[PDB]
Design an enzyme around this catalytic site. Structure first.
Site, PDB file in Angstrom:
ATOM      1  N   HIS A  74       0.842  -1.197   0.000  1.00  0.00           N
ATOM      2  CA  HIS A  74       0.000   0.000   0.000  1.00  0.00           C
ATOM      3  C   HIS A  74       0.880   1.251   0.000  1.00  0.00           C
ATOM      4  O   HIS A  74       1.021   1.967   0.994  1.00  0.00           O
ATOM      5  CB  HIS A  74      -0.951  -0.029   1.187  1.00  0.00           C
ATOM      6  CG  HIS A  74      -1.961  -1.132   1.117  1.00  0.00           C
ATOM      7  ND1 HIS A  74      -1.831  -2.308   1.826  1.00  0.00           N
ATOM      8  CD2 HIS A  74      -3.113  -1.243   0.414  1.00  0.00           C
ATOM      9  CE1 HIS A  74      -2.862  -3.092   1.566  1.00  0.00           C
ATOM     10  NE2 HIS A  74      -3.654  -2.470   0.712  1.00  0.00           N
ATOM     11  N   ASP A 232      -8.788  -1.387  -7.760  1.00  0.00           N
ATOM     12  CA  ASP A 232      -8.085  -1.704  -6.521  1.00  0.00           C
ATOM     13  C   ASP A 232      -7.780  -3.193  -6.417  1.00  0.00           C
ATOM     14  O   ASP A 232      -6.756  -3.576  -5.840  1.00  0.00           O
ATOM     15  CB  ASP A 232      -8.921  -1.240  -5.327  1.00  0.00           C
ATOM     16  CG  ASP A 232      -8.110  -1.120  -4.054  1.00  0.00           C
ATOM     17  OD1 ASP A 232      -6.889  -0.878  -4.144  1.00  0.00           O
ATOM     18  OD2 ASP A 232      -8.698  -1.257  -2.961  1.00  0.00           O
TER      19      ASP A 232
HETATM   20  C1  LIG Z   1      -2.003  -9.536  -5.132  1.00  0.00           C
HETATM   21  O1  LIG Z   1      -2.683 -10.195  -4.067  1.00  0.00           O
HETATM   22  C2  LIG Z   1      -3.378  -9.414  -3.184  1.00  0.00           C
HETATM   23  C3  LIG Z   1      -3.489  -8.038  -3.270  1.00  0.00           C
HETATM   24  C4  LIG Z   1      -4.173  -7.347  -2.288  1.00  0.00           C
HETATM   25  C5  LIG Z   1      -4.752  -8.006  -1.207  1.00  0.00           C
HETATM   26  C6  LIG Z   1      -5.366  -7.233  -0.126  1.00  0.00           C
HETATM   27  C7  LIG Z   1      -6.360  -7.537   0.720  1.00  0.00           C
HETATM   28  C8  LIG Z   1      -6.526  -6.520   1.771  1.00  0.00           C
HETATM   29  O2  LIG Z   1      -5.959  -5.473   1.970  1.00  0.00           O
HETATM   30  O3  LIG Z   1      -7.528  -6.933   2.622  1.00  0.00           O
HETATM   31  C9  LIG Z   1      -8.005  -8.149   2.173  1.00  0.00           C
HETATM   32  C10 LIG Z   1      -9.016  -8.876   2.773  1.00  0.00           C
HETATM   33  C11 LIG Z   1      -9.374 -10.085   2.188  1.00  0.00           C
HETATM   34  O4  LIG Z   1     -10.361 -10.837   2.759  1.00  0.00           O
HETATM   35  C12 LIG Z   1      -8.734 -10.533   1.038  1.00  0.00           C
HETATM   36  C13 LIG Z   1      -7.722  -9.777   0.461  1.00  0.00           C
HETATM   37  C14 LIG Z   1      -7.346  -8.565   1.034  1.00  0.00           C
HETATM   38  C15 LIG Z   1      -4.659  -9.398  -1.138  1.00  0.00           C
HETATM   39  C16 LIG Z   1      -3.976 -10.103  -2.114  1.00  0.00           C
HETATM   40  O5  LIG Z   1      -3.822 -11.458  -2.125  1.00  0.00           O
HETATM   41  C17 LIG Z   1      -4.398 -12.196  -1.051  1.00  0.00           C
HETATM   42 MG    MG Z   2      -7.504   0.701   0.814  1.00  0.00          MG
HETATM   43 ZN    ZN Z   3      -5.905   0.080  -2.445  1.00  0.00          ZN
END
Ligand code: A1D8N
Ligand code: MG
Ligand code: ZN
Ligand code: A1D8N
Ligand code: MG
Ligand code: ZN
Lengths: 324, 321
Positions: A74, A232
């Site tokens: 992030h 996103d």
């Molecule tokens: C590229 O892979 C990813 C990219 C972003 C995220 C982010 C996630 C996040 O911030 O809260 C979550 C809650 C959930 O229930 C499932 C996924 C996410 C998760 C990822 O993989 C698991």
């Molecule tokens: Mg966010």
């Molecule tokens: Zn984001």
């Protein structure tokens, strides 16, 4: 020359799968500033809203500063990626001339600020550790409220108000749309947002040109909410060499959160346990339960504009599955 | 000398303005310390008494004295009013000592640090508050944040000896209650209270039957909402002072809205206001539909309250020639 190569990569700003990480390198760790600048020139938003070019650069540089460069996922690269992905989803044929220049500006601006000052931990972590952010925002969309507050406040720094020449009502309408969009990036709203999008697809109305017919604020902001929500959650839809680097970064951030959770004697959040995590099974579950149900619904809304993106997501899912 | 007005701390119509002057402008600190020794809450949650006093003192200090209505007296009044709508016979031991504790603590903090202006004013003026809270329940989010924040100052954690889940559950309920005091949620909150009444289920003996949590929290939301909108249901000499104080606060806002070029908020223009028509409209369109529904839900119980309301409305209408 370095900026000759960077300028060549910025020709891909209208393409899914832009080399966002190489653009970060070539821009001197300013992917958000140069991609936002490029997009604003491309859409002619500087002339439409009388944005002075020096005010835009100054705000975008101050906004990029407030993304944490020591947070693995992030950060400003994620923000630039969401900005550019939203910009592409805005250009889809099924949405030609649907949105005003103000709504386009709101969706892109919302994408730019949507994760600013992200500390690298989840809302639930901030709630359970009685953080000052959770205390300020009463445990409700804690990060997303904070991203908005920071994003708007930075407009007040010296020569940073890029909206200085919008009329009062334009200001008020944009601020409301930006708020509604960023608050919808809260993952706790995903199920209800997807259900609304499913309902819209099933009752979809189209104009005589083939363009989607949006009739009121409720339908227009809901599409813009899901559009930024899709951008996103667009990492598994990108070419694999980009997807994999996003996976490396989010697992880096998650595992850090798990180390603090274990140090604190807390239950370790899902996917944050570096001694019990399956990176590959988590991505397959991420696609199967979150990303694919969302993007498959979005592809129905803009059919057939998103077939390639949906094809890539299903190939990438097959690939991650095959590594098990 | 103040302690015998406090003997009334269980009746609708506590002479709260008297208690305010007798306590040295500390009605909240003394009305809460009485309601806590009365419900025996210092034992059940092992609240050291000096710690409770320290929090209430710091809480009361964060209500503005130069704000005519949304000050510590209104907070003391809403605490005491919820405290009596909590002793209604139809609702008697249908709430935990923890849920009781939430509704009272929520009433106590529900307007803390109120600057004396509306949410719409804070939004339209690009205030720091509206900027922080994204134009959504700006004041009420801030009331909660300050109320919880003060628990962390020296010897103020009155919830120190709750268990871990109890604190999470109390926090969730207080948040749900205070956020429901936003007037922009009145119409939604009333339609849900009517729905609960439309297909109510009573025993036949008195008590009302709620099972889950979404409807048990709606009752204390409307309850604190009622105690927040209970000025026109109190005796006329109390009601009239509340009316003087709210119109004073409204007129200050209306002035600052004119030294700005803004559209003057309804009832805030001191050169175009009818204090008496506004109260009759306030009763007809907000206060009476809400209290009719509450008195239906708690039938009868709140018939003295509903009677006093329609008496006060008839009188204010009689002040209009
Ligand atoms: C590229 O892979 C990813 C990219 C972003 C995220 C982010 C996630 C996040 O911030 O809260 C979550 C809650 C959930 O229930 C499932 C996924 C996410 C998760 C990822 O993989 C698991
Ligand atoms: Mg966010
Ligand atoms: Zn984001
Ligand atoms: C004792 O009288 C009053 C006591 C409190 C209030 C407060 C009110 C407030 O803060 O926002 C309001 C909005 C409305 O639409 C009607 C009333 C109020 C209003 C009163 O009278 C109008
Ligand atoms: Mg209030
Ligand atoms: Zn109040």
């Amino acid at each position: 020359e370095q900026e000759d190569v960077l300028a060549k990569e910025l020709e891909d700003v209208n393409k899914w799968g832009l080399h966002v990480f190489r653009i970060a390198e070539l821009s001197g760790n300013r992917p958000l500033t140069v991609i936002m600048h490029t997009i604003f020139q491309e859409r002619d938003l500087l002339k439409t809203f009388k944005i002075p070019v020096d005010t835009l650069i100054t705000y975008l540089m101050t906004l990029e500063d407030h993304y944490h460069a020591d947070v693995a996922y992030h950060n400003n690269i994620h923000a630039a990626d969401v900005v550019q992905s939203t910009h592409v989803l805005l250009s889809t044929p099924a949405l030609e001339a649907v949105f005003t220049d103000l709504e386009i500006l709101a969706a892109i601006f919302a994408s730019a600020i949507h994760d600013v000052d992200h500390p690298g931990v989840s809302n639930q972590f901030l709630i359970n550790t009685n953080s000052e952010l959770a205390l300020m925002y009463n445990d409700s969309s804690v990060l997303e409220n904070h991203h908005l507050a920071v994003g708007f406040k930075l407009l007040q720094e010296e020569n940073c108000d890029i909206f200085q020449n919008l009329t009062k009502k334009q200001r008020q309408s944009l601020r409301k749309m930006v708020i509604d969009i960023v608050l919808a990036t809260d993952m706790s709203k995903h199920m209800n947002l997807l259900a609304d999008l499913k309902t819209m697809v099933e009752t979809k109305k189209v104009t005589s040109s083939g363009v989607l017919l949006l009739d009121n604020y409720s339908d227009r902001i809901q599409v813009l909410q899901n559009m930024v929500h899709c951008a996103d959650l667009s990492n598994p839809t990108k070419p694999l060499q980009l997807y994999r680097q996003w996976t490396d970064r989010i697992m880096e951030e998650f595992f850090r959160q798990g180390d603090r959770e274990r140090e604190r004697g807390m239950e370790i959040s899902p996917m944050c346990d570096k001694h019990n995590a399956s990176v590959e099974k988590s991505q397959v579950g991420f696609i199967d339960y979150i990303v694919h149900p969302l993007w498959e619904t979005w592809a129905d809304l803009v059919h057939p504009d998103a077939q390639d993106i949906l094809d890539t997501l299903e190939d990438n899912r097959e690939w991650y599955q095959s590594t098990i």
